[PDB]
Amino acid sequence: KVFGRCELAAAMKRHGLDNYRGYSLGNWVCAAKFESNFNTQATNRNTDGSTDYGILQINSRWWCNDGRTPGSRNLCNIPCSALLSSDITASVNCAKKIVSDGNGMNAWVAWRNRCKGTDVQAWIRGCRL
Ligand SMILES: [Cl-]
Ligand SMILES: [Cl-]
C-alpha cells in the first residue's frame, strides 16, 4: 500500500509514535517519506547482503529474519515479510525497539540526512489527526 501523508500520520498516531521517546509525529512521517516514499512494499538490498524492508526500511542485519542474511539477528522477532504488510503494526512495534536502543532516530540514515534539524511539523500540517 502507498500511504497518503495524512493517512500515515494518523495511523502512526494511533500506534503510539507521536512523541515516542521524544520524537514528534512529523519526524516519523518525514523518515517514512524518504525511506520508502510511503510504500509498505519497499525493499532495498545493502552492500553487506542484508535487506531493508517496509515503510521504515528496517534492516535484516539486526531486526528481522529473511532467511538469507547469514549471521544476522532478529531482534524484533519477526519475519521481514511481516514488515511489508499494508497494516503498519509490525513496522511500528519494531521501530519502537530500534529508536529505544540508544541511537534514537539516527538509526534511519534518511532521517539523519533529510529530516533532523528541519521543520518536521510541516509533514503533518493540514492533517486531521
Ligand atoms: Cl538469516
Ligand atoms: Cl533520542
From Swiss-Prot:
GO molecular function: beta-N-acetylglucosaminidase activity; identical protein binding; lysozyme activity
Keyword Calcium part of the UniProt annotation: no
Domain annotation C-type lysozyme: ranges: 1-129
Tissue/organ expression: In the egg white and polymorphonuclear leukocytes.
Positions with a binding annotation for substrate: D101
Keywords for the protein's UniProt record, in alphabetical order: Allergen, Antimicrobial, Bacteriolytic enzyme, Disulfide bond, Glycosidase, Hydrolase, Secreted, Signal
Pfam assignment, any one: Lys
GO cellular component, one term: cytoplasm
Disulfide pattern: C6-C127, C30-C115, C64-C80, C76-C94
InterPro entries reported for this sequence: Glyco_hydro_22, Glyco_hydro_22_CS, Glyco_hydro_22_lys, Lysozyme-like_dom_sf
CDD domains: LYZ_C
UniProt keyword Chaperone, yes or no: no
EC number assigned by the record: 3.2.1.17
One of the GO BP terms on file: defense response to Gram-positive bacterium
Active-site residues, Swiss-Prot/TrEMBL: E35, D52
Domain of life per record: Eukaryota
Family from the record: Belongs to the glycosyl hydrolase 22 family.
Biological role: Lysozymes have primarily a bacteriolytic function; those in tissues and body fluids are associated with the monocyte-macrophage system and enhance the activity of immunoagents. Has bacteriolytic activity against M.luteus.
Note: Lysozyme C is capable of both hydrolysis and transglycosylation; it also shows a slight esterase activity. It acts rapidly on both peptide-substituted and unsubstituted peptidoglycan, and slowly on chitin oligosaccharides.
Assembly and oligomerization: Monomer.
Protein name: Lysozyme C
Organism: Gallus gallus
Encoding gene, per UniProt annotation: LYZ
